Swiss-Prot record, chain B:
Domain KOW, chain residue ranges per copy: 42-75
GO molecular function: RNA binding; structural constituent of ribosome
Family indicated by similarity: Belongs to the universal ribosomal protein uL24 family.
Compartments, as annotated in UniProt: Mitochondrion
Primary subcellular site in the record, as a coarse category: mitochondrion
Annotated InterPro entries: KOW (IPR005824), Rib_uL2_dom2 (IPR014722), Ribosomal_uL24 (IPR003256), Ribosomal_uL24_CS (IPR005825), Ribosomal_uL24_KOW (IPR041988), Translation_prot_SH3-like_sf (IPR008991)
Alphabetical UniProt keywords: Mitochondrion, Phosphoprotein, Ribonucleoprotein, Ribosomal protein, Transit peptide
Pfam families associated with the record: KOW, ribosomal_L24
Subunit structure: Component of the mitochondrial large ribosomal subunit (mt-LSU). Mature mammalian 55S mitochondrial ribosomes consist of a small (28S) and a large (39S) subunit. The 28S small subunit contains a 12S ribosomal RNA (12S mt-rRNA) and 30 different proteins. The 39S large subunit contains a 16S rRNA (16S mt-rRNA), a copy of mitochondrial valine transfer RNA (mt-tRNA(Val)), which plays an integral structural role, and 52 different proteins.
Name of the molecule in the record: Large ribosomal subunit protein uL24m
Modified residues (Phosphoserine): 10
Presence of keyword Transit peptide: yes
Organism: Homo sapiens
From Swiss-Prot, chain E:
Pfam families named in the record: MRP-L27
BP terms from Gene Ontology: apoptotic process; mitochondrial translation; translation
GO terms of molecular function: RNA binding; structural constituent of ribosome
Keywords: Apoptosis, Cell cycle, Mitochondrion, Ribonucleoprotein, Ribosomal protein, Transit peptide
Protein name: Large ribosomal subunit protein mL41
Top-level taxon in the UniProt lineage: Eukaryota
Family under the similarity heading: Belongs to the mitochondrion-specific ribosomal protein mL41 family.
A single cellular component GO annotation: ribonucleoprotein complex
Phylogenetic placement of the source organism: Eukaryota, Metazoa, Chordata, Craniata, Vertebrata
From Swiss-Prot, chain F:
Encoding gene per record: MRPL34
Family (UniProt): Belongs to the bacterial ribosomal protein bL34 family.
Subcellular location field: Mitochondrion
Protein name, per record: Large ribosomal subunit protein bL34m
Subunit composition and interactions: Component of the mitochondrial large ribosomal subunit (mt-LSU). Mature mammalian 55S mitochondrial ribosomes consist of a small (28S) and a large (39S) subunit. The 28S small subunit contains a 12S ribosomal RNA (12S mt-rRNA) and 30 different proteins. The 39S large subunit contains a 16S rRNA (16S mt-rRNA), a copy of mitochondrial valine transfer RNA (mt-tRNA(Val)), which plays an integral structural role, and 52 different proteins.
Residues of the full protein shown: 50 to 92 of 92
Modified residues (Phosphoserine): 22
Source taxon at top rank: Eukaryota
UniProtKB/Swiss-Prot annotation, chain G:
GO biological process, one term: mitochondrial translation
S-S pairs: none
This protein's name: Large ribosomal subunit protein mL45
Role noted for this protein: Component of the mitochondrial large ribosomal subunit (mt-LSU). Within the mitochondrial ribosomes, required to direct the nascent polypeptide toward the tunnel exit and position the exit at a distance from the membrane surface.
First and last residue of the signal peptide: none
Subunit details: Component of the mitochondrial large ribosomal subunit (mt-LSU). Mature mammalian 55S mitochondrial ribosomes consist of a small (28S) and a large (39S) subunit. The 28S small subunit contains a 12S ribosomal RNA (12S mt-rRNA) and 30 different proteins. The 39S large subunit contains a 16S rRNA (16S mt-rRNA), a copy of mitochondrial valine transfer RNA (mt-tRNA(Val)), which plays an integral structural role, and 52 different proteins.
Localization terms from the record: Mitochondrion
UniProt GO molecular function: RNA binding; structural constituent of ribosome
RNA sequence: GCUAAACCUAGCCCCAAACCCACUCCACCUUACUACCAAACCUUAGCCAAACCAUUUACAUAAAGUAUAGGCGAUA
RNA sequence: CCUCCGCAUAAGCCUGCGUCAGAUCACUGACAAUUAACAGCCCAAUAUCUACAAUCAACCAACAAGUCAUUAUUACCCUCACUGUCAACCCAACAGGCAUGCUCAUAAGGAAAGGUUAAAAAAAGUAAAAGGAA
RNA sequence: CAGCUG
């Protein structure tokens, strides 16, 4: 019911709620996938509870009772999601040996730079996809000059940074 | 927090800080000397001894360590006096506030000699690294319950290894466990 | 009033620095080391002006032919325009001719 | 879910299923008078009306009957010290009318000082008859 | 006249404002007379479990110990998942042990993905 | 001075990303803005 | 404003949400908000044990001698305005109460011989020792102004002073410092003042009347 | 005595040395930042100098501003 | 007392006289809002059809010759998603301009006067003997 | 031309 968007009605206005730790990752690597599924919905409902409580906290111009447990619940959802992705990845390396879940290719757009192109799903094959074939994955020769100019802008920023680091080091040896 | 943000006695996000360090100020940065993470040897709660200024020779206890400015707040020493709670027409109260100290100005204290000793990080068989004084081979140790609420897992349920490592997906395992049965086979699309 | 009110921090100069104490050593490496090195092989600097002195048009010409192939694009371009300007100045302008 | 590539459906394919839902939700208090059945929520941008119906049905067991969504423009008119516009983020709002004649009202959420307060009671403001003379002295 | 502002759906003439949307995914398609057909199968079903008798709360008690992070590499998952079956069937066709060469016959294909999340 | 008489169709069709990439000259326009370091390469 | 409630209600009406943040450092007080047991003037060897178990070298038979020198020397620090010694001689509950009103005017307090011997009266008790002493002295005052013209007390003439001075000690590096000074309700009025005072009536807005 | 005035240190410049960058997830050549349907190369010109302008006019050391070229002139 | 203005949509703009609070002829911060039926966003192929304007369309009247359409077979069964919706607003000027539908003096929208005096000169309006372009 | 008009 909708009362699951709000916590225990005893806690209303108490300005401090004892919550435990977050889930770390290693505690969660011991749980089955069915158990991580169910824990995902536990943490999901808890997160919606705390977000309603934040928005009502800003509405009534008051501070949160305890804003820490929102950080803990986001912490736990992050750890849980990371664990599940680990198991997907390891199984993908065994069964197929790929490293990305989604295919792509190193291509090179109109602007000369090398880009990881992530593939999208389509229904028709690429040679008669009318919109895909309007994209240019090649740079013509009027770009190579700008590639050189960009290369030199990066080299100037790097040179300035490295030199500036050495000057600061000299000031530290003069001061100490 | 911006570049060349100046650290102070207030924590880096408080109200007093945003009064002191608004997002548009630019000050001369403090040249602090580089102390490596492995080489910082004053911890919160160490009994120390002040070498310079007022309260020289007195042995206090480190309360806060502001490590970005090589700082030690010896609680109860190196004090000036500020008012607090000053309203429009009440003069507040007089309070002994504490000015910090650089790590150079403070030395540690042997718990059996009560003397200002140099500290080197020697190594030990039992513990990989710990502080050892110089005037004696003495290990000066690093210094310093709970009932669960209705939404904490007990230590029992938090540590049950319910995970049998298999070669199935979370998706496939939940489809089996939830009793969801999918007859339609997935139809191959193009990726480009 | 562009004058400073407090006098600046003092300039502590170490006359017996490592550099100052050993300045000038091996300037006579030629004349009392059997001429195996010239003193001009003691100086460090840009590669196009080690043991060479010129006015500015000559420094620019020498820099272009010695290092100009690996100069950056708009530095090379600025330097070509400086030679073109300094050419048109030394050769066509002045008092004495 | 949000920030995920959805797999492409071809005609005769399996059901698209989400196992761990990415997008959260928060039910807000209405700023205007609302019918008793209506409940207001702040959906995230990518969540449709249908996703919200199945979301409340599946997870919270709420009998939802109607859903209507509006996208709210947050202001891009307030500036830094650098005269650069800060944007308050846009957000989607869901108005959910509950079924079976049920009714929701937003609950009334939110219904050393010894030293200071025990010197604020011993203040003892100066007598006007004392005429500025410090009353510390026993004379 | 703005360039700095994000080009959102609120912004063009009518023909512009109709086309651009936010990040939501298409559920069906338009037909003649602008009649939207919704496809049941494109709408995501929230597979939601039964939480009855479930012993995991959202927080962990502080009395639980500290452990070391050991991410699941494919060597580990091969070791525990596969290695007993190979040790047993070697002391006494790799597809026997939970390996599949292709997965074009499979519902939850691992590369490229078909499942969500 | 009411020379600017706005519409978004003329603005995107005149100076948008797609018209800029349609020609080699326009691609060089984008590349110059990308090299100056601009926040808006186009409309 | 005038209190904390006015500021927090104004910060709620404005929208200033001030989050109460958790800091590991607190304020290291060395004083007390007032007096432990208000000695009302005309058995406490408990607290003498609870002092000697910390200090362990403490003779009460020598203390009102010491309490004389903590008193008198502190008052001479008003003649020069030497605040840095006063922080050694006086507590921080007592420092503003004796130095605030005296700012921007010169005082010329002086001591002359006591009529009676000073004698300790009572003793009470993270731990704060607190000793009240009776002193019956003869002192001289002359409080001047910013402009150096006399506004209190003849400079030469000694006056007889009763002084129920309360001392306090922290119980590591602390000592006995003047904490307060009890003035009994029966005490005679002080010296009158050299100038005259008008005390205003109620400032009436037009809608109200004087009654 | 107001308005003000002062201030060092952000950073930068020139060298040297060394051959740089670039897929968390998602989106991005359609009206870029939008989940998903039937074609590239082709002498630079001119300013300017020649006191005009019309051919012409620069783009390690040393030989050497030599041989040469050139309205045999500017110059190269 | 004005009202040659209004109210809506279009284009444009993008939170720009909502509430709470504060600083400043006498904007800043917080919070809240615009809910689709109106409007955008359409269409399975392959063939094959589309001589006779509109004008109260009746004749009559014409020339400058016109704004509107299917059939045959095949395929086809799910259904209401997404986006726009606020304002005292835009382009200019430091006067002006603006598409369309209604209302044609208004049921809607507003105020020419900070206070005074009642000089000159200047602007605009009204009145003017006799004369009537001198 | 006649007429009107600061
Ligand atoms: Mg809407
Ligand atoms: Mg010429
Ligand atoms: Mg309709
Ligand atoms: Mg409207
Ligand atoms: Mg009206
Ligand atoms: Mg006026
Ligand atoms: Mg006139
Ligand atoms: Mg007349």
């Amino acid at each position: 019911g909708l009362e699951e968007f709000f916590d225990d009605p005893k806690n209303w206005g108490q300005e401090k709620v004892k919550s435990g730790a977050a889930w770390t990752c290693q505690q969660l690597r011991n749980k089955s996938n069915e158990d991580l599924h169910k824990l995902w919905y536990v943490l999901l409902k808890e997160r919606n509870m705390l977000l309603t409580l934040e928005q009502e906290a800003k509405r009534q111009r008051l501070p949160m009772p305890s804003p820490e447990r929102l950080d803990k619940v986001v912490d736990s959802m992050d750890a849980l999601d990371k664990v599940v992705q680990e198991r997907e990845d390891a199984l993908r390396l065994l069964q197929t040996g790929q490293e990305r879940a989604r295919p792509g290719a190193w291509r090179r757009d109109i602007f000369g730079r090398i880009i990881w192109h992530k593939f999208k799903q389509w229904v028709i094959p690429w040679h008669l996809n009318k919109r895909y074939n309007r994209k240019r994955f090649f740079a013509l020769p009027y770009v190579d000059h700008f590639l050189r100019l960009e290369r030199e802008k990066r080299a100037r920023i790097k040179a300035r940074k490295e030199n500036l680091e050495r000057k600061k080091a000299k000031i530290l040896l003069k001061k100490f | 927090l911006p570049p060349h943000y100046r650290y102070g006695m207030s924590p880096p996000g408080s109200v007093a800080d945003k009064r002191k360090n608004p997002p548009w100020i630019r000050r001369r940065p403090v040249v602090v000397e580089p102390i490596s993470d492995e080489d910082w040897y004053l911890f919160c709660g160490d009994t120390v001894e002040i070498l310079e200024g007022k309260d020289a020779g007195k042995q206090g206890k480190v309360v806060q360590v502001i490590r970005q400015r090589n700082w030690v707040v010896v609680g109860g020493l190196n004090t000036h006096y500020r008012y607090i709670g000053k309203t429009m027409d009440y003069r507040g109260t007089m309070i002994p506030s504490e000015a910090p100290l650089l790590h150079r100005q403070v030395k540690l204290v042997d718990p059996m000699d009560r003397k200002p000793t140099e500290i080197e990080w020697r190594f030990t068989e039992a513990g990989e690294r710990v502080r050892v004084s110089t005037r004696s081979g003495r290990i000066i140790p690093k210094p310093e319950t709970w009932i669960d609420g209705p939404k904490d897992t007990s230590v029992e349920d938090a540590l049950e290894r319910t995970y049998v490592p298999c070669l199935k997906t979370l998706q496939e395992e939940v489809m089996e466990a939830m009793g969801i049965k999918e007859t339609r086979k997935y139809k191959k699309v193009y990726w480009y | 009033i562009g004058i400073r009110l407090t006098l600046p921090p003092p300039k502590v100069v170490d006359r017996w620095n490592e550099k100052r104490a050993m300045f000038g050593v091996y300037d006579n490496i030629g004349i009392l080391g059997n001429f195996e090195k010239h003193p001009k092989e003691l100086i460090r600097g840009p590669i196009w002006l080690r043991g060479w002195k010129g006015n500015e048009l000559q420094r620019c010409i020498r820099k272009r032919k010695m290092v100009g192939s690996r100069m950056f694009a708009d530095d090379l371009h600025n330097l070509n325009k400086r030679i073109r300007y300094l050419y048109k100045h030394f050769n066509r302008h002045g008092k004495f001719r | 879910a949000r920030n995920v590539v959805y797999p492409l459906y071809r005609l005769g394919g399996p059901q698209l299923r989400v196992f761990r839902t990415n997008f959260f939700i928060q039910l807000v208090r209405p700023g205007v008078a609302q019918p008793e059945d209506t409940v207001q929520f702040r959906i995230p941008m990518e969540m449709t009306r249908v996703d919200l119906r199945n979301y409340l049905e599946g997870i919270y067991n709420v009998p939802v009957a109607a859903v209507r969504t509006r996208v709210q423009h947050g202001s891009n008119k307030r500036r830094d010290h650098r005269n650069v516009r800060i944007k308050k983020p846009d957000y989607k709002v869901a108005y959910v009318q509950l079924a079976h004649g049920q009714t929701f009202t937003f609950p009334d959420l939110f219904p050393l000082y010894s030293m200071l307060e025990e010197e604020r009671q011993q203040r003892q403001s100066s007598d006007p008859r004392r005429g500025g003379v410090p009353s510390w002295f026993g004379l | 006249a703005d360039r700095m502002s994000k080009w959102t759906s609120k912004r063009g003439p009518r023909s512009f404002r109709g086309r651009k949307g936010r990040g939501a995914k298409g559920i069906g398609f338009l037909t003649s007379g602008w009649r939207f057909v919704q496809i049941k199968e494109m709408v995501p079903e929230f597979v939601v479990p039964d939480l009855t008798g479930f012993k995991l709360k959202p927080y962990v008690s502080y009395l639980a110990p500290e452990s070391e992070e050991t991410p699941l590499t494919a060597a580990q998952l091969f070791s525990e998942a596969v290695a007993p079956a190979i040790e047993k069937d070697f002391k006494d066709n790799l597809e026997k042990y939970g390996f599949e060469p292709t997965q074009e016959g499979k519902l939850f294909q691992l590369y490229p993905r078909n499942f969500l999340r | 001075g009411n020379e600017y008489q706005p519409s978004n169709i003329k603005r995107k069709n005149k100076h948008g990303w797609v018209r800029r990439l349609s020609t080699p000259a326009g691609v060089q326009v984008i590349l110059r803005r990308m090299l100056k370091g601009r926040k808006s390469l186009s409309h | 404003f005038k209190t904390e409630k006015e500021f927090m209600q104004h910060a709620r009406k404005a929208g200033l949400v001030i989050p109460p943040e958790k800091s590991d450092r607190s304020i290291h007080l060395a004083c007390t908000a007032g007096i432990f047991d208000a000695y009302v003037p005309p058995a406490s060897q408990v607290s003498i044990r609870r002092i000697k178990d910390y200090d362990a070298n403490f003779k009460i038979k020598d203390f009102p001698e010491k309490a004389k020198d903590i008193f008198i020397e502190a008052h001479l620090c008003l003649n020069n305005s030497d605040h840095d010694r006063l922080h050694t001689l006086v507590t921080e509950h007592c420092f503003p109460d004796m130095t605030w009103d005296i700012k921007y005017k010169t005082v010329r307090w002086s001591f002359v011989e006591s009529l009676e011997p000073s004698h300790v009266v009572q003793v009470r008790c993270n731990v704060y020792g607190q000793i009240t002493v009776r002193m019956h002295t003869r002192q001289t005052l002359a409080i001047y102004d910013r402009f150096g013209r006399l506004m209190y007390g003849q400079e030469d003439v000694p006056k007889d002073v009763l002084e129920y001075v309360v001392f306090e000690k922290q119980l590591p590096y602390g000592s006995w410092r003047m904490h307060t000074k009890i003035v009994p309700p029966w005490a005679p009025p002080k010296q009158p003042i050299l100038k005259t005072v008008m005390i205003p009536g109620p400032q009436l807005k037009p809608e109200e009347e004087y009654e």
